[PDB]
Amino acid sequence: MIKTIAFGRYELDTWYHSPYPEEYARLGRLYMCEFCLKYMKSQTILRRHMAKCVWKHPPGDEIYRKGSISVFEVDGKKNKIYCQNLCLLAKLFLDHKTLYYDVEPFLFYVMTEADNTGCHLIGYFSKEKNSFLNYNVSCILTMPQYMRQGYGKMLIDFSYLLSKVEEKVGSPERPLSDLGLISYRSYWKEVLLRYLHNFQGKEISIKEISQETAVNPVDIVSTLQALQMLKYWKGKHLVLKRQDLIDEWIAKEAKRSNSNKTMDPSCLKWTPPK
């Protein structure tokens, strides 16, 4: 059974089982091309593949570019093999992913960091081309070697940027995992406190906040509740602009600017597909 993966210069311990063919699954280690995501049995077979493989980045269209950070839009119908390999790779670190074969109804947004050898996988999120429940993310993953550096929140922010340009309100697919929920709550906290910091008016509706942020009204209310900013005072519902929360937020978003871990809306070059 697969315990480790060789991925570029990294050796990654796998967390959950992924349904690779038994010919590959019975081996202890899998070697993968870091650009095309094809999986191989040995270091020797990988070396020979890397000499021949023409891919230095994901397929599809580069829709975001800020220096070394890119996002590629990959259509599951146009690049089926790449997207299946990506889903099999994702399933090694995602427990609850249940889709690896029929990738045709999905778009995959693949974030990369460039160096002099090519554009290296940071993480991704998948998205239904047409979601009945208006889900703007299906699954989301930061690769283990990049985790806890701010890239997950960049991916989340990017998913809402797409929703903003589409003139839609979005939400992640249910159910949300433990780590997913922690990440989304941090993001929703940031966006809400940003809005209220910049808003000068005397009142605001949840719908107005939802329209500007592309965040679902239920998620806004949930976040308002989590921050204890919804109060009651003689008959009416009231948004409490908490002192301590906005102070710490400015200190936090100073650090966010310093480390460059932000998605810049002006660096998106995108019109919705089809």
Binding site: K202, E203, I206, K207, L230, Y232, H237, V239, K241, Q243
Partner: peptide, 27 residues
Amino acid sequence: GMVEIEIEGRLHRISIFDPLEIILEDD
């Protein structure tokens, strides 16, 4: 277009379309 869950042991029901008043510390 409503939502519910308790605030300080009191179950409440909030509209998403109505303007909600924004407050600082106060009383």
